[PDB]
Amino acid sequence: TILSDVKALGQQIWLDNLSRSLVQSGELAQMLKQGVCGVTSNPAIFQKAFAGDALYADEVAALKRQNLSPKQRYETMAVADVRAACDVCLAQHESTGGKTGFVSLEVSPELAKDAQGTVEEARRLHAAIARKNAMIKVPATDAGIDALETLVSDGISVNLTLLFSRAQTLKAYAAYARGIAKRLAAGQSVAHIQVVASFFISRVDSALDATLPDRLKGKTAIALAKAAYQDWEQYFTAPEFAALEAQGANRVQLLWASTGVKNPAYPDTLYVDSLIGVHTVNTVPDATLKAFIDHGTAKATLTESADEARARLAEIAALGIDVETLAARLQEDGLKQFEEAFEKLLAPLV
Amino acid sequence: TILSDVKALGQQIWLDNLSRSLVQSGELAQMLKQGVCGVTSNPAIFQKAFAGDALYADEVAALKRQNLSPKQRYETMAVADVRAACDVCLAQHESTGGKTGFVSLEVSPELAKDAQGTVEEARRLHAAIARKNAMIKVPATDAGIDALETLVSDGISVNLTLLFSRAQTLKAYAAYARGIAKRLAAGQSVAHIQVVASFFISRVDSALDATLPDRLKGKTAIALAKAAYQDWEQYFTAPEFAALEAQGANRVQLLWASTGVKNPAYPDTLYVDSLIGVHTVNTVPDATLKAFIDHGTAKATLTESADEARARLAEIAALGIDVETLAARLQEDGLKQFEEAFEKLLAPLV
Ligand code: NA
C-alpha cells in the first residue's frame, strides 16, 4: 500500500533493475500491480543481468554463430528485454495518458560527448524498440543536452542521466523547452513527450561524508535535491513554460537516482523517505524497494524545511566545498564507470 | 495567425455559437483549422438556431410523430448537434492530451435553483451525448454550485455559467475541489474532469457605463476579470489545491464570455484584446471572432497593470456601486432571458 500512498503525494516509484527473468517470470507485472510505475536500466544493470540470468544463454549461443559485433549482440538481447518490459508496463502507461509506465534504455557510454552520434543511436534504438513507453537514456553532458533538444524535437521521450549539478539540470530544462517550442511551431504533438532528469543522490554523500563535520554528514545530497526541486518549481511555473503547459506540454520531472543507501550508519530507506514530493520519480534498486515497502514512510518531505536545506548548502560552500566542481567530477567518474561496465558487458559476447 | 499567437500566450479561443448547419456545412471544421479550439452554446443560441436553420425541419417533423414531449424533441436535436460538433472537435481534443476541443450544452434554465434536478438532467444529457469532450453547462447559482460538486464527483465535465462575481467564482472553486477530493478518496480518475468558469464581461459594462464617470466607462468588466484571474492564481496555488493537483487534478479555468462589444464607441476587439493570459479561454460570437482575426492584437494583457484593476475596483466601490449586488442581479436577469428563450424554443415542438 505504501507505493499508493506515495502516488497520492505525487511521486512515482520505479524499479532500478531489468533482466529477462524479471520480465518473463511475471515478477515485473506483479510489481506494477503493487504500485511500481516504471523501470530504469543502465550498462551496469545489464552487465549484471547478462552475467547472472540463465535465460540469456541460448540467445548468446545463437548470436555467437552470426557475424555480429559484440555491441550488436548486446543490443539484440537488450532491445528484446526492453520491448518485453514495455509490454508489461503498457496498460499502466495508457491508463494515465502516457504519463507513467516507462522503461529506459541507455545509449552507449562511448557516445557521451558526441551529440550527433548520440542522436543517431537514440533514433535507431527508439525505432528498434518500437514502443510508445520506452525512454532513451542519455548522460547529461553538454553534448547530451544538445542531443536532448534534438530528440525532444523528434518526439522521443528521454531519461537524462548522471546529473549531479543544479546548473546542468537547469540547462537541460531550457533545451527541453526549446524542443517543445519547435514542435508547437511545426504543428506537432507534445502531449506524449515525457522527459525525466535523473539526479543522483547517494554518490554525493559518499564523496563528501568523510570530510564533513558530524552535523553535516549524510545531509548534502538531500539538501542538494531539495534545492534542485526549488529550481524546478521556479522554472516550470514561470510564464514561458506556463504557456507551453497550457497548450499541452508536460514538464520535465526530477527523478532521484542512486537512492540505495551505501553507508550502513544511515537508515536503508533514507533516500526514499526524504525525497517525496509532487511530480517527481524515485528509481530504486530491488533491495531498497523491498525495504521501503517493509518499513518506509510516505510523507511530503521534499518540500519540508527547505530553508534549512539552503542553509546547509551555504554552510558547505563556506567550508570551501564547491558542489558544482564536485558535480563535474562525479559525472566524469560515472561515465568512466558506465563505460567500464559496458566493456565488461561486451567481453563475453565476443 | 492571430489565433495561433494567442495559443502561444496560453489562451484558447472558442466559438460562442452552435447550429446544425455550422457543423454540417464544414464551417466548424474549417474554423478549427484556423485556430478555434471549442464551442459553447446556451438556450438563446439554440432558440436562434432552431428558428433560423433550415436543417432542423425534417427532424422536427419526424419527432412530432413520436410519443415524446417537446423538451425531449429539443433534446434529441440538440444532443445530435453536440455529438456532431464533439466529433468535429475530437482530433483537436486528443492532440493536446484532452486539454482543448470541448463543446458545451446547457441544462434547462427552469432547473437553475434546483440542485437535484440539475444533477439528474446533467447526468442524463452526459450519458446521451456519450462524448469525452462534451461539457454540461450549469448556471453558477448556489444550487448550481451544489450540483457542481456532485457532478464533478460523478466524473462529469461542467461549464459553470452566468458568473459575474468574484465571490461566487471562489465558491465554485471550493465546490470543485470537494468533488475532486471525493474522486481521489474513491480511487477514481480525475485527469479527464474539466471545468470552466464562464465569467461574463460586456453585460457588466452595459449595466454600469451610463452612470459611471467618463474615466471609468468601459473599464469595470475588464478590471473585474483581471482581479478574478489574480484570485484564481491564489486559490489554485494554495496548499489545499496543490495536494489535489499532485494527484492529477486539473485546475478550473476562467473562460471569458459575453465578449462581443455592445457599445459602438469601444473597439470591437476590446474584450478579446484586453483579457489574454495563460490558462484561460475566451468564447467569442462569430462577428467578434472575425474582427479579432482581422485586426485583433495578441499580447499578454490579462496580467498587465493588475494593480490598476485593483485601484479601479476600489474607486467603483467608493462611488457606492456594489459589484456583488450587481452580479446577483445580472445572474437573475440572465436566467430569465434564458427561460424566455427556452420557452420560445419548445413552443413549436408540440
Ligand atoms: Na498573482
Residue numbers in the entry:
A (entry chain A), B (entry chain B): 2 to 351
From the paper:
In the redox-sensitive enzyme transaldolase from Neisseria gonorrhoeae, the side chains of neighboring residues Lys 8 and Cys 38 at the protein surface form an NOS cross-link under oxidizing conditions that leads to a loss of enzymatic activity through ‘structural crosstalk’ with the active site. Under reducing conditions, the cross-link is disengaged, and enzymatic activity is restored. In the previously reported redox-sensitive transaldolase, the NOS bridge functions as an allosteric switch that changes the structure of the protein, including that of the active site, and thereby regulates enzymatic activity. We have recently reported the discovery of an allosteric lysine–cysteine redox switch with a covalent NOS bridge that regulates the enzymatic activity in response to changing redox conditions.
